[PDB]
Prior knowledge:
Two copies of one chain form a homodimer.
Chain A: H1 2-8, E1 11-12, H2 17-25, H3 31-35, E2 40-42, H4 44-52, E3 57-63, H5 75-88, E4 92-96, H6 98-104, H7 109-125, E5 133-137, H8 138-141, H9 148-157, H10 161-167, H11 176-180, H12 182-186, E6 205-211, H13 215-227, E7 234-238, H14 259-267, H15 291-299, H16 303-315, H17 324-343, H18 347-353
Parallel strand pairs in A: 3-4, 3-6, 4-5, 6-7
Antiparallel strand pairs in A: 1-2, 2-7
Helix pairs in contact in A: 6-7, 7-17, 14-17, 15-17
PDB class: ligase
Keywords: aminoacylation, angiostatic cytokine, apoptosis, rsgi, Structural Genomics
Assembly: dimeric
Amino acid sequence: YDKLIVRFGSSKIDKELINRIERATGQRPHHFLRRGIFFSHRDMNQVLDAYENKKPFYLYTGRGPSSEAMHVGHLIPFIFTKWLQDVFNVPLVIQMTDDEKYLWKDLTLDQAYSYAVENAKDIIACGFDINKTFIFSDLDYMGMSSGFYKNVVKIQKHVTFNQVKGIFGFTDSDCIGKISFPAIQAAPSFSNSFPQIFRDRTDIQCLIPCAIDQDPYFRMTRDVAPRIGYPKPALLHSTFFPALQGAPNSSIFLTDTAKQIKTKVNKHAFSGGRDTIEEHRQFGGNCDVDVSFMYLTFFLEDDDKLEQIRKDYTSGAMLTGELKKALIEVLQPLIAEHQARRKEVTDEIVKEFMTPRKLSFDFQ
Amino acid sequence: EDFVDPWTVQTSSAKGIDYDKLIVRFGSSKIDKELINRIERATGQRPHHFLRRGIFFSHRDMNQVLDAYENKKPFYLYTGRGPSSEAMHVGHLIPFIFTKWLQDVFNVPLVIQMTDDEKYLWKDLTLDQAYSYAVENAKDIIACGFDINKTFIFSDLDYMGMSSGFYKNVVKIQKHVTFNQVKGIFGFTDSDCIGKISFPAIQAAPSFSNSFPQIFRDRTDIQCLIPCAIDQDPYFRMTRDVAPRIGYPKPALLHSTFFPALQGAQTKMSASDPNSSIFLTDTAKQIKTKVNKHAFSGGRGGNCDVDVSFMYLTFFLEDDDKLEQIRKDYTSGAMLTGELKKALIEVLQPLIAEHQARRKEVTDEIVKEFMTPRKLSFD
């Protein structure tokens, strides 16, 4: 990961920049920062500069509404974005790319759109404030903005096929909606794409939380920005979420019960311990390629108890199955609590989050 | 004829584009002697001259528009205009006044797409400028006399961002046209901006009732009829291919020949104009100056098949017998060029003068109304 930074030319967060946040925030850096889940960035300093100089900034993230079974991995950006929203108290804009799924998959426009509404339930279950978050459907919001399509057009002019052909790999057997889709993903990065929220303001920086594997796709947007008179969108990159069986039982869905969660991490997670304990008691603990532990890295909020689990699993004291039932006690209460929060999401709360509204934000 | 596209029209021949051949290549159908009567019977009106003199000579499924009009099932008219700049020419009047004619004789709603996004992409303009031209060009279009309770005129940049139905159709059409197909119709290249690669779906979209929920109450099946010069047909031949794939009725069409450029019937009157157009902004003096000096004569006698003045006469005189008398006469030698041009100047001068007058009457508030999404009158 330290070599993917140099590869994409991004800036690495320290344990010193993390402090800069704490000074304006007034909290304790989220464990993603503390642990390095979210390690890289691009222009966080620029966003920070305006936060103290008493100027707003906003967040943006999206979601590809392809059915659901949003697994626990998919929670990583949202958990972090939610945090960002609360410590800075700024607006967030969440995009549901229904057109995209329609273009790429065997769905009807309605089918893609219903998935967008449903996924929006799961997202709201994460707890986003309703007074500073706007979840929008591409298909819906294009028809309801006096600023969105215009920005999409500006981008479409300043980007050629050859450009989108290298970055995304589009060939020419593809449909045109695809070739031009990258402009729809980019448009949300610029404030005046949301008139009911921001107005015709253009000086509001945009912070985009996402992976590190994504930087090459967001550079297109960052490169077009100067060219159209708009500031670049800042970035905060994260690491990947270990695929369960190894880096259908392949992932752990938020719709999974409690026993399924139990039987998955027990029968399908990956082990680093010599596990087939010839005599794992002073060996075993490979906390780099052991999924169960990697997960605790994301979901167990206590550093002290985590380090204890690492010293102990690596040393050989803690066997496998012991570490596993430790994770289960973190997931089961994470997932089940998610499902409950999502039960309380009425058809009217969804419609609200998805309605072009004025928001309550920190101009500061 | 050789080349006819949405951006260029070229022929080696002074007689102009071979229209019976364009019909074979494009796959459209010739407007028969007997299809014209059906228009008469069905509308109880004499067919407009463009129909009688073969100016609008090609169609697609007009028999299906009539199939429905006869049975009391509506249909609507859709046509468009790319505002490349503020000034339009007299060739532009052909599709519009004919559309104004279809509107009255059939009494059906009409939508007119002002493609500001198309020109913002293809040309060097700001979004402000591109919208500006849409507004100005709408005044001239309005000057043709369209019923305000029966016509919707929209800028693409504005209507895309305010319609619960337009973008959705663009997206649907976009899924069914590959870059490969689009570069084999419009000749696009890997160097073109993405906005241009996908632009075709935006022109294809008004071809479906759905993009105007406010007009046809989310009805989805109202038959569409599109009047246009035959250089806009690649867009619509693409559209009719896509329509069934997204469960919509294919749009019908009526193609017109091109109003020749002054120098000859090799190109069409365009706004580039090295010096080839009579702008709807020209003074009586300029119109006369342009006809006498710039309009290719044929003549020196008289060959009607190449005289740019006589071609113009077949578009705006409106007296089949006089035109026919001007034909035999110019051919035989009796008429003698300066008289022929003198005649044409007597028709164009008032035509453009009445246009300007009515245009001066289009107040800002009227442009606004025509361009606001409305219900219309179930026309």
